[PDB]
Design a protein around this ligand. Sequence first.
Ligand SMILES: [Cu+2]
Ligand SMILES: [Cu+2]
Ligand SMILES: [Cu+2]
Ligand SMILES: [Cu+2]
Ligand SMILES: [Cu+2]
Ligand SMILES: [Cu+2]
Ligand SMILES: [Zn+2]
Ligand SMILES: [Zn+2]
Ligand SMILES: [Zn+2]
Lengths: 335, 335, 335
Amino acid sequence: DADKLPHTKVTLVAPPQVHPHEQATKSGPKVVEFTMTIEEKKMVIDDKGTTLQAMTFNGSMPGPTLVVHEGDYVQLTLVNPATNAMPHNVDFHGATGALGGAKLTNVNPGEQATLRFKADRSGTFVYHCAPEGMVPWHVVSGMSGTLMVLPRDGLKDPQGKPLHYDRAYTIGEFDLYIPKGPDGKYKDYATLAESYGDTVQVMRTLTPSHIVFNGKVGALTGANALTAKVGETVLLIHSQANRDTRPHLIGGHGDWVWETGKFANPPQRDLETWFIRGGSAGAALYTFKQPGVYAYLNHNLIEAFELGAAGHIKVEGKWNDDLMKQIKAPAPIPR
Amino acid sequence: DADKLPHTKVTLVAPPQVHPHEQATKSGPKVVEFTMTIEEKKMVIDDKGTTLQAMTFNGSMPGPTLVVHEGDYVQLTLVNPATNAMPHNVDFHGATGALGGAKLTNVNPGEQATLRFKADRSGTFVYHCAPEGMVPWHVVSGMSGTLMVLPRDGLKDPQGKPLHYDRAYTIGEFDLYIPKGPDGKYKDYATLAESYGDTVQVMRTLTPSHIVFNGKVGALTGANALTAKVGETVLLIHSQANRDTRPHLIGGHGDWVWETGKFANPPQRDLETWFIRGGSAGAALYTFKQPGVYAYLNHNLIEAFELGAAGHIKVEGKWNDDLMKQIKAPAPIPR
Amino acid sequence: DADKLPHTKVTLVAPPQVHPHEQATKSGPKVVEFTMTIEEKKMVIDDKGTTLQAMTFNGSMPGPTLVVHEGDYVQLTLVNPATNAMPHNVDFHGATGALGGAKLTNVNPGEQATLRFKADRSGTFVYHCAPEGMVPWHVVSGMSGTLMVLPRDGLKDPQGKPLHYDRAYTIGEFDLYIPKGPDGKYKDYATLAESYGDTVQVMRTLTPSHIVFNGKVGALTGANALTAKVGETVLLIHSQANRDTRPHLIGGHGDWVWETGKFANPPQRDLETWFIRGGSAGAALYTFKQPGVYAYLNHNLIEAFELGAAGHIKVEGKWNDDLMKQIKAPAPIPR
Ligand SMILES: [Cu+2]
Ligand SMILES: [Cu+2]
Ligand SMILES: [Cu+2]
Ligand SMILES: [Cu+2]
Ligand SMILES: [Cu+2]
Ligand SMILES: [Cu+2]
Ligand SMILES: [Zn+2]
Ligand SMILES: [Zn+2]
Ligand SMILES: [Zn+2]
């Protein structure tokens, strides 16, 4: 019984970070309490000033990653401030019943609700808003994130041997559908409601105008590049609530990958590129062996480079000439 | 030898039902006899009266699911009535040789043929029409269904333990390519032949006008919703003969899933969303734990909600507060 | 240490063939030396004279398949002749560091470079050109191929039993983005540089004009069909550096398939259709049991039949009536 268990309260952190947590734990099941606040806002999504009338959990795309252990109970308070225009809710793919909790969390501006569910299956799971009659619009405008349910004894390889990560990052990939006017320029809308009709028309073409990691072209680059060191194992959580993607780490691999994102299944090893089904979250481990700047991208390279689905990982440490060596630098072809 | 074995005759049933069959069986191999009759017809495919010049096995999209056991022989009589305009045939992905049987089943209007093949591999397999020079048109117009070949000892989990379903449903998902006129309204064609040229032009854009379960937007909703009860394990067969899809059960999971649809492989567990490759059939088991109305959909939510790829499952039984509980109903945010 | 090991030199062969190699080997690790020369050229890609301003490794699409064993070192000399207009490089997905080697192989026309890397992971891996700021253009114009890294003890089934192929073919699938003029005819460009702007515009629509195996509609058909015999096991390597595809052998199966292309993972059996993620190479084994002409295709049938993603395999041997038999040839429906 959940009402017998101790409660803990978790403070969420903004992507691409994930809140502190244990992997393998000696602790027993708890009710883990979270709160998130919905924020509708206009966001700038590229280098040319294009805007999105966005909708977010906690002010970010994706929403923050919530981490519990299998057998824990997730207790979320969902707050929809009066400053918002739309009703919202939440559907946890990690949850059982009531359309993932959406039926029990319908909150108008000025309202909040509290949902509890048993996190009885291990894995990374999408959560998203799903208000009746406007589900795809709320999802594509930014309302999704990941629930990670770790097995109580941590991650395991196909032989049941232990696996771990030293650092975790969370990447949400967002296919955006920004309308254009007769002049061919992207439209800028005074309000969220006004963007609706034009946006549905673009959606129906199934062609995104932009595909971005974490809310903007280049969000995970420059000062905002992800970071690691040679010898460190990184977990890369990748969520795509609406559309397929194919993550790839340039100069790296997926050492151990759950592409369908469910930890009770054995992971695959040595992947060059993996596949995240639209409407799911997956997870890859990589241990860095070479220093330098990596790209982490959707390996539809048009989607990555033209449309925005690419980030960077800056890695410190010592170059290994055994793994790779420039034998002859670029030089004139011998006569 | 097939000519030594007893024969049985099976009466097919219309989707979403599947004809009565055993899973694990004590019976030995048989020649299992089926008949299907091709029907070309104009069908209404949405709520606004849009029509498709369709082509079907047995009058339905998808055609009926045929069920045999591994080692059985499938013996199909394929009938193309004189009331039809086009030649047709059948390609069983479950079969070996002669382009899946297409080369041996070329039937003009007024003709029939009988094909036998050994069902020597377990799984759900697409069958479809494939007449030379018009293969994609016949497939996208409705001519596909599933052959399920059950292992003789029934379904098994990754550890070789037994799995079963108490109820089976079959869902065919159809990417449709309906042309539009200068006025932007969908075209209605007097005949099947007349729809061809315009339809090929739409196909070549790779953008479906509609994506529907079982022949129509909302085919598996209302009076036609699928049904189950808490405690019942349902098999959901999903076929897509031309285009990728990503099935998801809202408020549920894929407890055991063969997404590539081949039962000799271990299934994955706890899936939120799985992946059916265009040109294949997959299979998922789910045991219901909560009552209420579920949605079963393609989790490209635009494809589901805007284009038609979504159905409903109405489930009876008792709510389980341990799995999910509304702690605080939606209420004013405390001052 | 690589500088302690013996060296061997390999002569590459044009697709769809793959250079002679051992599978399971008694040999120890070597530095395996390869050379490839970049050729930019205008190529005719369909039956109606449409041209592509193409870019190739060794004059072919795909580039040749390089085969080594796990633990070997790949040492590639990459030559960019002065007759070319563009800078190029190479990114091996099979390699670790320096963006797959791209950072160490930047060659202007008239230059060459030599890269060494440790092939420490088994599988089929994409290699492609990736010059900074023009990565997708170089890839979609033809600059990709496969590195196959065989395990030292050859291929294994899920139970660790030996698997092998008697013949290997390599298929690269290329989503092409050829621009059209106001008249709706495909544009023909005097130079590679001139094609750039228009091509980027087409790319951004995410809709290929053509999708071809090995450089042209019908490249693997007629005199150029692949060949086998009943009783022979064929390895089919399928690379797609930019876009998802779903290979299928009509009248056949994937007997053993690594769809994500990494041999340390167990293969799946009995596949009807498998999935190659954009930015990866996969591998399927099939042992022929029936003679005749097979099609090997992308089972988005529009992509196959309308856009060009289909080839043929002509197979010799004896028909097996146990696997498939025409019981009744097409005949008038009995009155
Ligand atoms: Cu919302
Ligand atoms: Cu969902
Ligand atoms: Cu037909
Ligand atoms: Cu087929
Ligand atoms: Cu290049
Ligand atoms: Cu790459
Ligand atoms: Zn570590
Ligand atoms: Zn049961
Ligand atoms: Zn052999």
